[PDB]
């Protein structure tokens, strides 16, 4: 019954910045994870709340595919109960996550010479991020007790910082494309399971 549009997500020309992670709904298809492989050298495929071996014998009300890019030393922060800049400011996953993440290196395809400024991450925020929340406001974040009326300068920085991806970066500093599939199931007809 049709194949899930995993190409449109994994083969996508450009991934959104982590602070504006995309969200594509996938339903009314069959998840054939066999074809997912042989697409770059994956760096992580770890699933919580569901045994991968039986992934083909169960399906859900729907699944949400959130795609973004982060540096390797940061990918470990994409997991329930984790802490870090990404975990508290950009992308936060609930402790009861029912789904799992996929990460693969994209250095050869997503690291321009001299710095790729197309990708930004939120480095400052007043408070942590609630699970599955999106923030895109670029208001000037004051740090001290001196209001700056929205002017960049001393003790008042621009919240977003661009990732300086370069070919000569560290082994783990190179960009990593991350796609998180959140399997959401309720008392509704199932939508996305592969061959029995």
């Amino acid at each position: 019954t049709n194949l899930c549009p995993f190409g449109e997500v994994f083969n996508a020309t450009r991934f959104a910045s982590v602070y504006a992670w995309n969200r594509k709904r996938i339903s009314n298809c069959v998840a054939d994870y066999s074809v997912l492989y042989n697409s770059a050298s994956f760096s992580t495929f770890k699933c919580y709340g569901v045994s991968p071996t039986k992934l083909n014998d169960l399906c859900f009300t729907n699944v949400y595919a959130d795609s973004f890019v982060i540096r390797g030393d940061e990918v470990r922060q994409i997991a329930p109960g984790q802490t870090g800049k990404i975990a508290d400011y950009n992308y936060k996953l609930p402790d009861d996550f029912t789904g799992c993440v996929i990460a693969w290196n994209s250095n050869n395809l997503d690291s321009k010479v001299g710095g790729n400024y197309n990708y930004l991450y939120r480095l400052f925020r007043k408070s942590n991020l609630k699970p599955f929340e999106r923030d895109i406001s670029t208001e000037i974040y004051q740090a001290g007790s001196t209001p700056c009326n929205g002017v960049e300068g001393f003790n008042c920085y621009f919240p977003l910082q661009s990732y300086g991806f370069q070919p000569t970066n560290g082994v783990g500093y190179q960009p990593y494309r991350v796609v998180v599939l959140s399997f959401e199931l309720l008392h509704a007809p199932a939508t996305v399971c592969g061959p029995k």
């Epitope: 050869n108 395809l109 690291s111 321009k112 010479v113 001299g114 710095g115 790729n116 400024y117 070919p167 000569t168």
Partner: antibody, heavy 120, light 109 residues
Framework: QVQLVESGGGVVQPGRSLRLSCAAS????????MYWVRQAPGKGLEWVAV????????YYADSVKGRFTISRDNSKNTLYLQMNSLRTEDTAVYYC?????????????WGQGTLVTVSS | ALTQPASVSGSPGQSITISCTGT?????????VSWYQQHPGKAPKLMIY???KRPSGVSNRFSGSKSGNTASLTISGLQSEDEADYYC??????????FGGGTKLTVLG
């Protein structure tokens, strides 16, 4: 296919200006970093210059530091190399490489490239 | 720069190896080498993408490999039409794209 055409330049006197233009088509020029690579007649290749995908950062080989200037304009999809204070040793054929998808640190397309002769 | 053999010769059919070496910064620490084949009077075109890979459309015979500080190309069943110059590239620190030098392949015709 992807085309890259160099304006070229005839024999010029040593220590005189010269503008070379590489015009590209068939791919997203404004999304990749071009390179200029020289080859002396009968010798091996030698990287000359590179410019970032938006012109913010430019890098030059030590041999041409402080004399060349690489720029680009995405409005008309062209790349320019300005040469000042030429030297006799500098005669060579210039290739305008692209660094296409699945690699930006490496040179891929290598348009036909023109010839520049520096003799008095 | 990098060091390469001045010339390599070989009859058609067998395996031919071409090796280039540099300091740790050029290739010993960075696995970004990529080799180009330039025919006489022609624009060089990529042959081995990355340390060991090949762009779509190139011959399957060519195969790149890396041994510690050295990088080598292996050609299986090379034909007469494979007679051309071969350069090994490498991305070093602070940019500075070094180049292999020169290596000519000939067939005992």
């Amino acid at each position: 296919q992807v085309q890259l055409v160099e304006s070229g330049g005839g024999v010029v006197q040593p220590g005189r200006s010269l503008r070379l233009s590489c015009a590209a088509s068939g791919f997203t020029f404004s999304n990749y970093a071009m390179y200029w690579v020289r080859q002396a007649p009968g010798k091996g290749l030698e990287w000359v210059a590179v410019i970032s995908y938006d012109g913010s950062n430019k890098y030059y080989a030590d041999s041409v530091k402080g004399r060349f200037t690489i720029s680009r304009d995405n409005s008309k999809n062209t790349l320019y190399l300005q040469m000042n204070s030429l030297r006799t040793e500098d005669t060579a054929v210039y290739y305008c490489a692209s660094g296409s998808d699945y690699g930006d640190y490496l040179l891929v397309y290598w348009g036909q490239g023109t010839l520049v002769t520096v003799s008095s | 720069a990098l060091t390469q053999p001045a010339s390599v010769s070989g009859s058609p059919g067998q395996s031919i190896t071409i090796s280039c070496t540099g300091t740790s910064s050029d290739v010993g620490g960075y696995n970004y080498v990529s080799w180009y084949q330039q025919h006489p009077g022609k624009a060089p075109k990529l042959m081995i993408y990355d340390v060991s890979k090949r762009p779509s459309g190139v011959s399957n015979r060519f195969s790149g490999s890396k041994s510690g500080n050295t990088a080598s190309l292996t050609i299986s069943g090379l034909q007469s039409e494979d007679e051309a110059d071969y350069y090994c590239n490498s991305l070093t620190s602070i940019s500075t794209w070094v180049f292999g030098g020169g290596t000519k392949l000939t067939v005992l015709g």
